[model samples]
Target: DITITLDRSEQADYIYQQIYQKLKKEILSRNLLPHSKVPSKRELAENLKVSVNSVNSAYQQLLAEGYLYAIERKGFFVEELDMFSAEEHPPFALPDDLKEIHIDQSDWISFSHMSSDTDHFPIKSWFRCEQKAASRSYRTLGDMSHPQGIYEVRAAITRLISLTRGVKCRPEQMIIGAGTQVLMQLLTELLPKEAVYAMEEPGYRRMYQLLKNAGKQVKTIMLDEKGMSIAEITRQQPDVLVTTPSHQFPSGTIMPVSRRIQLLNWAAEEPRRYIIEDDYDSEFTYDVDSIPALQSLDRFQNVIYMGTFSKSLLPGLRISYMVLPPELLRAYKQRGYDLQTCSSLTQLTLQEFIESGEYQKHIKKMKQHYKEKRERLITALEAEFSGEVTVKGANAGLHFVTEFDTRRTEQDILSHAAGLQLEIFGMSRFNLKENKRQTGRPALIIGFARLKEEDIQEGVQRLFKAVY
Candidate 1:
């Protein structure tokens, strides 16, 4: 019997990669022969000591990639591909060789995270748009779609991004993908070889790790209330800078507009240097139009602005996009990365979603929905808890932080929350090093986006009860 196993990791990387590798090996080794019925989800889950959901997700991926086929009610069967023959793979590898290799893994709670709260999905609107896009978006898209991506989706994004975030770019400037993490890798290949990249400190840790692994020199610039330290940026002078200006991650501070201009000015001044502004979670800005994206201020050609449907539509949509600067357009074309763009099917559907104006509606609904949840949560926290739990992100985004009293440790809160069957994260996990914040209050990140209105109130009430 082929001993199917799951690779264990805490990160939310696509589990499909591991499943693919493992299944490929099994099939080629003749342990899992072609056309042989593979272990079902329940069996695989049990054998691997993992969740049935994880197994299902991995199986869905295999089906998508044509690696496996379903026999209605029976089970999955491996496809006979000509690329790698079964005779090539030998029997059992040494444990030592396998032990040293670590697969990139992620345990993202995209679906579960959203479900933890009242169901926030705009089902009627999304489904209607999805149906419309599937049926009518043909003449504009035509048969045999272009790999540059759907023009309508890109064009709609151009207007939406400019109007909403103050980012200025034509549709031709954007390239869509499943997420920012994937887009970052694409940018790495597009820019100069071995270029140094600067990112916000306590910034997007996954992107930081990925860049370093891919051989780019990465420097972490510290952030304060004003955003990434401009003075440090000037001193470091890297080839490119990545920032989350609309709302800085983990800390929940918006990058000041003046500082944004300063960074842009610095980039404009430098030859061959540019900025990739990851406008993550701009849709959830509570009180204001999202701080204008860095691309809006790029008349001098210095910004590569990125946004993701992950925050707005759902993280799993994997729909991320970037609007490139005019200066880099010719260079990008010359390099021919357009051919390497993501699935045109998703782009086309998104185009219809955008042109139908449903995209805007979906965003508006979610904004209002999350806003109410945030208020309810804040009120509950204030009413139930006595200790200091100052909200750092009520003004924007899906999550906010509660900084505890100076004496209290964040671990105490995590332990208590875990005991109550409530999932939460420590602010320190987002920091560069665990001890970086030496003198301040300990913080806990609370994401109410995935919780129901009643659940948010009840959960926080439970949390405070536990704390006191």
Candidate 2:
């Protein structure tokens, strides 16, 4: 019943996105009534002269966003929106420059997030768990759950962390949130408003932005070989230290036990001091065993540990967990009535996935899978660039940074790659303090988790030809 039109001439947007945008517009305009049955993916695809996959993608996005809901075998239905009437809106248009910029999906390779391998996603097993969880939705969906998320998921996470990363904690100390950013917002609220924070330089830019937006004084500490410079942190004497020590972001330096001890000592130096250890990619360490999480070594209960499923599983899951120290947990509890941010169904389904051993098996399989991909990427870079590029942070994580010893600037290199339709990120973009950036060092942070093995080689070849 839903008639959506696509402009085949619009090359800026993907076909799936075009369908999605048009459906969303129709829904918002009240043309698609709530609880109305939508056309089947097959029917829609045929009508639109596009592939079923394209229609499915658009439907999935709508389902995920709650604009539509699926009833097994029945079809998809529009969800009820709280609106009396639709308002007139101006026609949407893209600027000429924006429309001209395009990354050909069929050809170009992107080194973005270390996305999980969708082809190997244990979809059947996951669907089984999801179905099982859905069957029990009477109790879960009917009632309000705890703000800290379901206890079963927290317990499963605690067990997994204790066995794998040696992170000791009670399930009561864990708080499940939608993602790291959400937990960070809660954490910022718990901390003293006047507290000064220190973050790793050339590190996770999002964290820095979050802290700054929260009105906390943020200082950037440059990293040394062992990890973030403890000396610099000591000099700054900030109230909280946020870091990715297990495998530092971008640079990917594993902090030694000695340096970890130094950080613990720094935290103990003041009662108000705390450390945020973001072990975002600790599960993917290769060529060496992953170092113990900084929180695992805390004797003063000063470390707050954060971990996410974005890397190990799917980023679309948007599920992340955090372990707060006893004191901070007490503070969080004192702040009255903070609602749970993630879906109870997702938490329950993940609990089943972990308990059934499917999660562990998938992690083991992905470790091997990514190890091969990592090797392919490193080998390709070495062979393609020879000694002209120095690759760092290849031992762990899905991405590594390659520094080119050349007269070419970062802009020059970026433009060159852009011309070849290859996307690459500059290392300096992550740095908060520009004065601390390495002089004349142009580096590309390349990721391989999402790229196919052949695409990895081809991407490197394109990059080599572009920059060299």
Candidate 3:
């Protein structure tokens, strides 16, 4: 079976794209297994009835991205991948001279998600959290991390989640990581390769990309106001279902109780399947107080709860944790214990910060700040433009989505907006199956949380002007 396919008589960029993608799906699906020989270039060209050059170019890109590898005197082969590389490379290595490593010297912004406003950070209060974490022994905060996480920080996280998300799990179940993206990679090693992963549509693109790159076949599950389509989920019978239930990314709506239970029951039916509950930004719900986590509904231990302090605390903190089900605990811990600990010092800082209740106070202040910012964007869009546009997602969270009128294509609008020096995302940008056909009108995914208050009003006006 050939990994690269060429379609003759297709010259347009999009059409050629279809040919490129079909070949990628075929290769990554392991239909073309690693080290498996692919058809000769001429053979592929002849079979698909296309010019040989286009097929060759597609293969080259795949090779660069580590998807395919080529050998001399031999045709191309799928990447010879052993995901859990035998060589044990710890997540990071600290310098021998800890004092020489100035914590402030490193690049901090790279770890952060774009925020609504960096200038608004309360430097005085933040310094208090840092100073408090430091008042204790240097050994407590300065050395390596405990496999689970800083016990105190984990305790803080457990209590916070319990109070808000209704999820009840101890610090032991929580495995810490640098960010949610890293957690996705860890799950790949822990979960079955052939296991089906049902991902929310127009969700976090980075997640689907990481999973696909890790060799999982992702089912791009469609989303509605209620969240993922439960009936469709039943039909597909996915092995793992990933959802940002508290605040659905891109769209931002909280998953209703009905859909949440239906998903839990579905996972329960298939004892092996699990739901990845991404409670990202669940802390900032403005309409009500905090909402309980989907993990709370896990009567059958089917949910894996996740949360991050990056929004309320520092994103560069490079720390997030997972509450694994007992059944999956062995594999998860084995993979996590030695590997996922954040630096003991950073953990210690957060440990003290959270234990002192400063984290909760910061979250409360941020919640009020972002709620005003989110509401401002909505009001501006509504009052100025009478056009039919929709906004969805939890009122909580750093970002929200704007679904514009469906008369024009999402891509064209983004391109036009780009021409004006504005960067905006389209709903389809996050879709898993790029070639997969869809029937509905597409939406634009605008993460307004990243823009400043001044820019939010201006950006919306620019967007409205571009569309009309």
Best by TM-score: 2
Q: Which sections of candidate 3 miss by over 4 Å?
A: 1-116, 141-143, 335-337, 405-408, 436-442
Q: Residue 345 lDDT in model 2?
A: 85
**Local distance difference test values of all predictions, in order:** 0.72, 0.84, 0.71
The lDDT leader among the candidates is 2
TM-score of 2: 0.78
- TM-score order, best first, reads 2, 1, 3
Instruction: For residue 189, give model 1's deviation from the true position in Å.
Output: 1.1
> On a 0 to 100 scale, what is the lDDT of residue 356 in model 1?
78
Please report how far candidate 1 places residue 388 from its true position, in Å: 1.8
TM-scores of the models, in the order given = 0.72, 0.78, 0.71
Over the stretch 50-123, how does candidate 1's per-residue lDDT look in tens digits? 77887788788788878789978867898776655447677697787768876542221221223233356665
Give one digit per residue, the lDDT tens place, for model 3 in 428-449: 7666677863536656665655
Evaluated against the true structure, the overall lDDT of model 1 is 0.72
Q: How far in Å is the alpha carbon of 154 misplaced in model 2?
A: 1.0
Question: What is candidate 2's lDDT per residue for 1-468, written digit by digit as tens?
Answer: 656667778556888898888888888878999889999999988988899999999999999998899888757998888885467765667577458775447466777655655677887998888888778665666587789988878999999889888999999999998999999999988888898999888788888888888778999897888889999997878999998887788787878889999999989987889999998888887777766788888888899999888887765788899999888898999987799998988888888888889888988888889898888787887888767878887488877888887877887888888778787788878888677566576787877777766778778888885676
Model 3 poorest ten-residue lDDT run: 104-113
